Amino acid sequence: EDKNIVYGPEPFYPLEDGTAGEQLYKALKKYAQLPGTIALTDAHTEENISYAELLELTCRLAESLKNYGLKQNNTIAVCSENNLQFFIPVIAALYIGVAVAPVNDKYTERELINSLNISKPTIIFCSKKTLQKILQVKKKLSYIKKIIILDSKEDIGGYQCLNNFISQHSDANFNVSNFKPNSFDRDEQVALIMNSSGTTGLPKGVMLTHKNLVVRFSHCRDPIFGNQIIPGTAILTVIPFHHGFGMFTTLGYFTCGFRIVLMHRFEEELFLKSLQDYKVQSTLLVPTLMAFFAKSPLVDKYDLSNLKEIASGGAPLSKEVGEAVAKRFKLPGIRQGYGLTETTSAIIITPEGDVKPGSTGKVVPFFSAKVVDLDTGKTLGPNQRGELCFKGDMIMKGYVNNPEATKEIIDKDGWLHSGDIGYYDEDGHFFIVDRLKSLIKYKGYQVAPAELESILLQHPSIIDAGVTGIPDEDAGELPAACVVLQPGKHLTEKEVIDYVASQVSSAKRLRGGVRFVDEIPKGSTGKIDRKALRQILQK
C-alpha cells in the first residue's frame, strides 16, 4: 500500500525562512556587493543588467508600485517576450506581496482576453512588441488601469515607459540599501498566476504561493537536486519566461547568482556562439534541441568545452538522444526534470551522482509520488505503468475562481493526477511514457507516440519526429509519423516504415504512413501539436 508510495529524500539543509520576495532580495543584495556580477544578458543585443542594477530596479519599482497604490494581493500582469526587463516587475511584485500573472506574448486577442479575465490585473507591463495588442484588448477590459512599457526609454503615444513610471513614483535619492521587502504569510499569499489548461477543459489560472516558490528555491540550491554550477557561472536558457518551466528555473537562477543568458527566439548559430563566447557551463533545453546537440554538424564549429550541465524538460526525451548528447560532449550524463504548471516546477529531477538513461530522475525533497492503475486506481509497484500522481509542498493552491476544476485534478485524498503515464524502477528512477491523451487508439491497443518517436530519432538521418494517430474507418486510428531529415540526407517513406517495423510489435507499426516536413509543430516548452500533425498527415 504505502509500500508502493515513493518519497523524496530530506532536503540537504532545512527550508529557509521568509517569503519568496525576501529570499530574492537577499540574493540580489549579496551578488550586488561583488564587483562586476551580471544577472541577465541578452544574446541578441549583448546588453546586460548587473546584479547591482537589478537590485536597484526591483527595489525602486517596488517602492513605486506602493506609492502608485498597490497593496498586498493586488495583481499585475507581464506580457512580453524573453528580455532583460521581464523579471523587474516579477521580482518587485514579490517584494510587496502582489500576485504576478505572466501572459503568453504570442496569444491572440481572444486568448489574451480569456487569460486576463481570470487574473484581472490592475497594471500590465508589456514590451514594445506587445504594446499594440495590449492596447487593443484594454479597451474591452475595465479592470486594467495602467500600461507600462518595459523596454522603451521613452513614453509611446500616451503610454508610460518603465523608467518614467519609476521616476514619477519614487524619489531619485531613494535609499536602496535600506529598502526591505514585506513579510506576510507565505503559505497563503499567491505569488504567481500561471496559465494551464490542465487535464481537461479551457485554459485556467494556476495559483502558486510564496511557499511553493521557496520550496523551489530550496531545490535549486540543494547540493543533490540543484544546478551543479557555482555562483557567477553563465547559464543559457531558451525557455519562455511566461511558462512555469521558464519562470521557476529562471527565478531560481537569481538565488544562485548565475549570469543568465537569454534569447527571445532560438537561432542555431547565435545559440552556439553564445554558449562559446560567454563560456556557458549549463543550458536549459527542450528535446528537439537535445537532438540538435546530438546530431548537428554545426556543433563541431564552436568551442563548447565549458558546457557540462545539459538539461531537458517539458516533453518526453528519448533515452538514446540523451545518451548521444552525453557521449558527444564527453559527459557522464545529462540533466532532466519533469513537472507541471500545477506542481510549480520539476518534481522529478536527475540527482547528483545518480543517472539512469531514459529516466527523468527521482522524486524531489518535500514530495511523494505514486503510480495508479488506469482501470482500478490501485497503487502500483515498480516497473508497472499507470498514471503518475503527486503530493507535496509545490502543489498549487488551486485554479483561480474554479474550485470545480481544482477538485478534478486534486483528488479527495490530496493527490494531484498528472494525466501522464509512467513507471518507476526498483531504485526509484521514474520514466515518462507519454501523456495519456496522446496515446494512439489503434483498435483495442494504446500506442505511445514517444516510443515511436524515440525509434525514429535513433536513425542517423532523422533529426526530429512527431507521431500521432490518423483517423481510420476500421481501426479507429493508425499510427503515422512526421519526420524531419538532416539536411543533405535522404530517406523514403518505405525505409522509415520498415525501420520502425523491425523494432516494434505489430500494433505499433506506422500503418498511417510517413510524411517528411521541414519542422515538427511543437509549442515553446516542447509539446508536440498532435492536431497539427494530423492535418499534415491528412493533406
Ligand SMILES: Nc1ncnc2c1ncn2[C@@H]1O[C@H](COP(=O)(O)OC(=O)[C@H]2CSC(c3nc4ccc(O)cc4s3)=N2)[C@@H](O)[C@H]1O
Ligand atoms: N521531463 C519530461 N518528460 C516527459 N514529459 C514531460 C517532462 N516535463 C514535462 N512533461 C509534459 O509536460 C506536461 C506539463 O506541461 P505544462 O503544464 O505546460 O508544464 C510544464 O511542462 C512545465 C511546468 S514546470 C516544468 C519543469 N521545470 C524544470 C526544471 C528543470 C529541468 O531540468 C526541467 C524542468 S521541466 N514543466 C506534463 O504533464 C508532461 O506531459
